[PDB]
Design a protein around this ligand. Structure first.
Ligand SMILES: C[C@@H]1O[C@H](O)[C@@H](O)[C@H](O)[C@@H]1O
Ligand SMILES: C[C@@H]1O[C@H](O)[C@@H](O)[C@H](O)[C@@H]1O
Ligand SMILES: C[C@@H]1O[C@H](O)[C@@H](O)[C@H](O)[C@@H]1O
Ligand SMILES: C[C@@H]1O[C@H](O)[C@@H](O)[C@H](O)[C@@H]1O
Ligand SMILES: C[C@@H]1O[C@H](O)[C@@H](O)[C@H](O)[C@@H]1O
Ligand SMILES: [Mg+2]
Length: 490
């Protein structure tokens, strides 16, 4: 009863013998109870999990193509009730090769919710077409809003020759970013220049008058507020809701006109913030409005092909990174939905990372991993949407060898009042979530454990002298935060 548009349907997967190959569960043939949410169009569907592993007949089968006979290390990504996991046994088969292994219980209280399980024994694969099957052979049950169930939910399988993994990890280690400047700066400002946002003075949402509002953006007004709250960096939102880009881009323009600006606002933000040694990183969203820029990520025509889209992302990262060089701290401080959306295309993470660092070899890579474990060994920062909640403190063993987050460094991304400003009738509708004293404790804790915080204060897309661009109550709180954390202490 499961539905997949041809671009999402099961197909034979080419193994990349020198790389980590990832294959979503819905690329397997499913039998028995196994099911997933419908995927009826070329557009990615976040909720990709396979559910219904209830009996020994509930089995999924991929078809993969190896270039030569070799042993492959298998990782599984899954989630579910610890009650269910504590009694689930996995079985991975191909040819005569068979792996049997108990599931791992999630013994941390934080994200990641999905865990990556490296199976101890390797799977031998013959040259050419191999069928690989996954099923459970022992089963648990949930025990005592406790309404929604938490079944075993399979996300993906990952295949990598053990020798390729050592070499991959070696290279990741050699280009790992040095984040001391973020720890020393303690916190920065997330600013959403959001295409859905309506200006303080009313009128068209930023998305429908993007170039005009970029041309009228008052950098000096913006920098003085950033400076006043003591931010050490700014993460600035490119392509939030549409693919509009606040500066020149040969890469974007060669796909489709109308998204770029004559004014190089990124450069002016660099220079304006640079006068006070405040650094700039870029948020970028590779999916929102992408159907109006590139089109379907898997292209047109009868069979899915992501190389055009991959080449766009790589050429875009590369052009931005080289355009600004070391003046731009990162063209990829926050790449939205790396977990929910980007991961589902089995993308070439390393090529993206090399593009990101081409102009700035220490540029931190921050793919948003959502509730998922580390997306690629070439990550630098833990990144996900903290909403307006108190920042979680992930326990240290997550970062040790074998850990879910190994190679990453802890970091928090959350908002004081909201993400996108919702100003209506000259009044901010989004108030700070907590008292000033609670934010002070939050930043003091982040500082004591050397975890950078990037806090969003909803900003009016029309940045001018005529009106507060941030909520004055929010500014007042951050001024008290600055005093308690960055001010003269005694
Ligand atoms: C054979 C596989 O086909 C898919 O469409 C791609 O997304 C994979 O990266 C690989 O090329
Ligand atoms: C730009 C925004 O990014 C988020 O990740 C999405 O979930 C929103 O709906 C919107 O697309
Ligand atoms: C067969 C598929 O149908 C869809 O409607 C199209 O958007 C795809 O690109 C492809 O042509
Ligand atoms: C702007 C540059 O960003 C890089 O990521 C940093 O490592 C450098 O110290 C410099 O500040
Ligand atoms: C940083 C946040 O990322 C999330 O994925 C989005 O849904 C929010 O709008 C915001 O942009
Ligand atoms: Mg510190």
């Amino acid at each position: 009863k499961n539905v997949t548009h041809p671009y999402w349907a099961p197909k034979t997967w080419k193994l990349r013998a020198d790389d980590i190959t990832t294959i979503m569960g819905f690329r397997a043939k499913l039998k028995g109870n196994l099911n997933h949410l419908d995927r009826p169009t070329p557009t990615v569907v976040n909720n990709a999990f396979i559910r219904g592993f209830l009996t020994k007949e509930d089995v999924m089968t991929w078809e993969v193509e190896a270039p030569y006979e070799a042993e492959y290390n298998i990782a599984l990504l899954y989630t579910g009730s610890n009650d269910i996991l504590s009694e689930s046994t996995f079985e991975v088969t191909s040819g005569t090769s068979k792996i049997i292994e108990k599931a791992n219980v999630k013994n941390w209280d934080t994200r990641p919710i999905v865990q990556r399980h490296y199976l101890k024994q390797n799977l031998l694969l013959k040259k050419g077409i191999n069928k690989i099957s996954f099923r459970l052979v022992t089963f648990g049950k949930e025990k005592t809003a406790n309404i929604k169930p938490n079944p075993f939910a399979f996300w993906s399988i990952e295949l990598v020759r053990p020798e390729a993994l050592v070499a991959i990890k070696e290279r990741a280690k050699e280009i790992k970013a040095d984040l001391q400047w973020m720890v020393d700066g303690k916190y920065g400002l997330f600013v959403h220049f959001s295409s859905s946002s309506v200006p303080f003075e009313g009128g068209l949402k930023l998305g429908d008058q993007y170039q005009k509002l970029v041309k009228d953006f008052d950098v000096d007004v913006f920098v003085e507020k950033v400076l006043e709250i003591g931010a050490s960096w700014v993460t600035f939102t490119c392509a939030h809701g549409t693919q509009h880009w606040p500066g020149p881009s040969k890469t974007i323009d060669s796909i489709k006109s109308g998204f770029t600006c004559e004014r190089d606002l990124i450069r002016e933000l660099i220079d304006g913030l640079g006068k006070h040694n405040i650094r700039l990183m870029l948020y970028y969203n590779p999916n929102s409005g992408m159907e109006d820029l590139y089109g379907n990520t898997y292209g047109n025509g009868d069979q899915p092909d992501p190389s055009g889209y991959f080449n766009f992302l790589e050429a875009h990262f590369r052009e931005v990174s080289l355009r600004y060089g070391k003046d731009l701290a990162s063209t990829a401080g926050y790449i939205d939905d790396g977990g929910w959306k980007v991961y589902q295309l089995d993308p070439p993470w390393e090529k993206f990372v090399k593009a990101i660092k081409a102009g700035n070899p220490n540029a931190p890579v921050g793919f948003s991993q959502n509730l998922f474990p580390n997306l690629t060994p070439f990550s630098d920062l833990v990144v996900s949407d903290g909403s307006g909640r108190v920042p979680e403190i992930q326990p240290a063993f997550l970062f040790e060898k074998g850990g879910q987050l190994e190679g990453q460094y802890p970091a928090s991304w959350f908002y004081m009042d909201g993400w996108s400003s919702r100003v209506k009738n000259g009044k901010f509708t989004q108030k700070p979530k907590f008292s000033a004293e609670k934010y002070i404790e939050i930043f003091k804790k982040a500082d004591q454990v050397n975890m950078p915080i990037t806090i969003n204060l909803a900003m009016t897309p029309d940045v001018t002298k005529g009106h507060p661009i941030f909520n004055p109550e929010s500014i007042e709180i951050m001024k008290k935060v600055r005093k308690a954390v960055k001010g003269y202490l005694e």
